Amino acid sequence: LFTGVVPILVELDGDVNGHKFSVSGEGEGDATYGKLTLKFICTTGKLPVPWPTLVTTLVQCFSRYPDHMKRHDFFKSAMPEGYVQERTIFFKDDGNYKTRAEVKFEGDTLVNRIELKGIDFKEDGNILGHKLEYNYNSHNVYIMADKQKNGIKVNFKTRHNIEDGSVQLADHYQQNTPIGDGPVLLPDNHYLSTQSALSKDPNEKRDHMVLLEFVTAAGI
Amino acid sequence: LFTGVVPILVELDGDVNGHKFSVSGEGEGDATYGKLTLKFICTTGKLPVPWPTLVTTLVQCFSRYPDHMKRHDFFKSAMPEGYVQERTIFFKDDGNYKTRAEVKFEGDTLVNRIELKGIDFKEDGNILGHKLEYNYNSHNVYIMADKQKNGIKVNFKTRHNIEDGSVQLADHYQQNTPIGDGPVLLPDNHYLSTQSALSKDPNEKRDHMVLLEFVTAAGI
Numbered sequence: 390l391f392t393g394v395v396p397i398l399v400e401l402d403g404d405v406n407g408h409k410f411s412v413s414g415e416g417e418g419d420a421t422y423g424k425l426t427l428k429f430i431c432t433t434g435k436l437p438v439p440w441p442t443l444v445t446t447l448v449q450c451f452s453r454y455p456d457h458m459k460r461h462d463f464f465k466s467a468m469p470e471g472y473v474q475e476r477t478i479f480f481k482d483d484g485n486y487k488t489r490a491e492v493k494f495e496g497d498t499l500v501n502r503i504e505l506k507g508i509d510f511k512e513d514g515n516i517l518g519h520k521l522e523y524n525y526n527s528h529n530v531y532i533m534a535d536k537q538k539n540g541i542k543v544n545f546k547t548r549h550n551i552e553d554g555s556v557q558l559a560d561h562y563q564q565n566t567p568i569g570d571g572p573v574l575l576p577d578n579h580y581l582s583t584q585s586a587l588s589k590d591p592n593e594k595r596d597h598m599v600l601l602e603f604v605t606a607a608g609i
Numbered sequence: 610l611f612t613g614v615v616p617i618l619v620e621l622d623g624d625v626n627g628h629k630f631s632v633s634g635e636g637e638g639d640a641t642y643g644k645l646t647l648k649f650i651c652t653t654g655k656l657p658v659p660w661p662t663l664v665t666t667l668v669q670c671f672s673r674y675p676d677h678m679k680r681h682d683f684f685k686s687a688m689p690e691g692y693v694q695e696r697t698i699f700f701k702d703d704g705n706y707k708t709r710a711e712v713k714f715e716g717d718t719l720v721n722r723i724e725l726k727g728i729d730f731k732e733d734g735n736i737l738g739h740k741l742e743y744n745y746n747s748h749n750v751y752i753m754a755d756k757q758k759n760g761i762k763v764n765f766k767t768r769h770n771i772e773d774g775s776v777q778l779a780d781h782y783q784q785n786t787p788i789g790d791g792p793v794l795l796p797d798n799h800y801l802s803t804q805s806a807l808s809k810d811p812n813e814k815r816d817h818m819v820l821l822e823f824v825t826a827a828g829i
Contacts, residue, residue: 422811524804524823526746527770550747550802552827582770584744586804588823591642601821603744603808607772 390468391420391450396498397427399447403505406484406517408437414447416600418499420465423453425602430595438507439521440598441549444585445478445561446488448501449530452581452604461576461609463532463541463565469494470569472540481558484510484517493568515549515557522550525585534575540566541576579608610688611640611670616718617647619667623725626704626737628657634667636820638719640685643673645822650815658727659741660818661769664805665698665781666708668721669750672801672824681796681829683752683761683785689714690789692760701778704730704737713788735769735777742770745805754795760786761796799828 399414416427429440429447436443450464464472471493478486490503510517526548535542542564549557567573581604588599619634636647649660649667656663670684684692691713698706710723730737746768755762762784769777787793801824808819 422808424808522747522802524747524802526768527742527744529770529774548746550749554749582742582744584806586806586821586823588642588644601806603806 390494391465394419395451397425397448397501398498399427399429399501399503401443401447401503401505403507405438405486405505405507406510409433410437412436412443412447418448418451420451420453423451423604425451425600425604427600428590429598429600430593431597432595435596438516439519439523441521441523441525441587442480442486442516442559443505444525444587444600445547445559446476446486446490446503446505447600448492448499449474449581449604450492450499452606454606458579458606458609460574461579461606463534463574463576466574467567467569470567470571472565472567474563474565476561476563478562479560480510480514480516481560483514483557484508491568515551520551520553521557522552523587524550525587526550527582527584530581530583531578532576532580533578535564536575538564538566539573539575540564577609579606581606610714611685614639615671617668617721618718619647619649619721619723621663621667621723621725623727625658625706625725625727626730629653630657632656632663632667638668638671640671640673643671643824645671645820645824647820648810649818649820650813651817652815655816658736659739659743661741661743661745661807662700662706662736662779663725664745664807664820665767665779666696666706666710666723666725667820668712668719669694669801669824670712670719672826674826678799678826678829680794681799681826683754683794683796686794687787687789690787690791692785692787694783694785696781696783698782699780700730700734700736701780703734703777704728711788735771740771740773741777742772743807744770745807746770747802747804750801750803751798752796752800753798755784756795758784758786759793759795760784797829799826801826
């Protein structure tokens with residue numbers, strides 16, 4: 390499945406404090422190197438929220454799991470059927486995103502379709518206030534197996550550089566469970582070390598985000 | 610000069626607590642997009658220090674200066690003759706790098722040749738102890754004009770994720786002055802917003818670092 394380069398498609402529908410929009414993404418992933426190369430176009434015009442805030446929301450299976458941690462790769466063990474990924478993202482002293490996605494294989498393409506709903510977002514907030522910088526730092530995504538659910542409960546904090554130099558924090562409460570009924574690899578506690586660089590397509594006129602990302606699993 | 614893609618060559622000679630080594634780098638830069646794409650091979654074997662610590666040391670002229678800040682682009686205004694870049698990097702509660710480089714044009718290639726000397730580095734330190742993660746965050750590089758010197762004094766702090774989750778800080782004291790005698794663009798206070806992603810060449814056997822970086826000037 391993931392032994393080669395894989396086409397990714399990301400569809401998303403969102404509503405933030407009433408502001409309704411969409412984003413369509415296309416790119417490829419290479420799990421053996423943990424590389425992502427996506428391109429997001431906002432298909433409703435101008436994105437009512439900063440692009441960096443949707444990064445964690447817009448395909449954890451492309452992480453590179455060193456050979457000795459392969460029995461810890463839940464993400465891929467759910468494929469090709471897929472898993473539902475849910476999250477509650479609390480931006481500090483601001484609003485919160487609630488998202489549910491189904492990432493699974495459709496054809497040769499790995500598809501991540503999401504619904505985003507955010508509320509309680511201040512208009513003088515860095516988010517709606519659009520005071521966030523166009524960049525991203527590296528974080529540690531902490532994975533844990535959830536027995537009952539036969540999934541994993543992931544949780545981590547994100548740091549968003551604000552233009553005034555300060556940093557906007559975002560607490561992610563994530564849950565993943567298989568869509569199929571089959572046996573799945575439940576893992577030992579470990580984390581994924583992610584790095585991301587946001588950029589712009591020179592020949593693109595529509596509002597968008599170019600994202601390059603490297604993810605490798607570590608811990609065990 | 611920088612209106613197109615430019616070949617970059619990075620030569621470096623180092624001594625850290627007695628450990629003497631070298632690194633040769635090759636890649637290209639595109640100032641109009643602020644992109645860097647370099648590839649570093651350590652030519653003496655295994656690098657006695659972690660690769661992330663040499664990132665700030667291993668070509669500020671490829672930063673993208675939005676059109677309205679062009680009179681603030683000192684880096685490029687010193688070209689093709691070049692500028693000498695000096696720094697004193699203090700790693701918190703550990704040693705310190707002292708470096709001097711001459712980045713200037715040789716042929717069609719922009720060449721950055723450095724000498725690195727580091728001392729007072731603990732062997733149980735994260736640096737020598739090699740306890741630093743293979744990744745990088747985004748930072749703000751603060752530029753200021755230095756009258757007397759007819760250069761710029763830059764200063765910023767770097768955050769290095771340690772594998773135990775904590776963060777290793779590095780205080781950079783930088784100075785840049787032209788090599789040529791001609792007039793140079795001294796700027797108003799501003800900063801460069803940099804993002805970097807470290808990676809590995811799949812087909813490379815020698816110890817190395819692949820670096821992708823985007824830098825854009827902001828402030829004014």
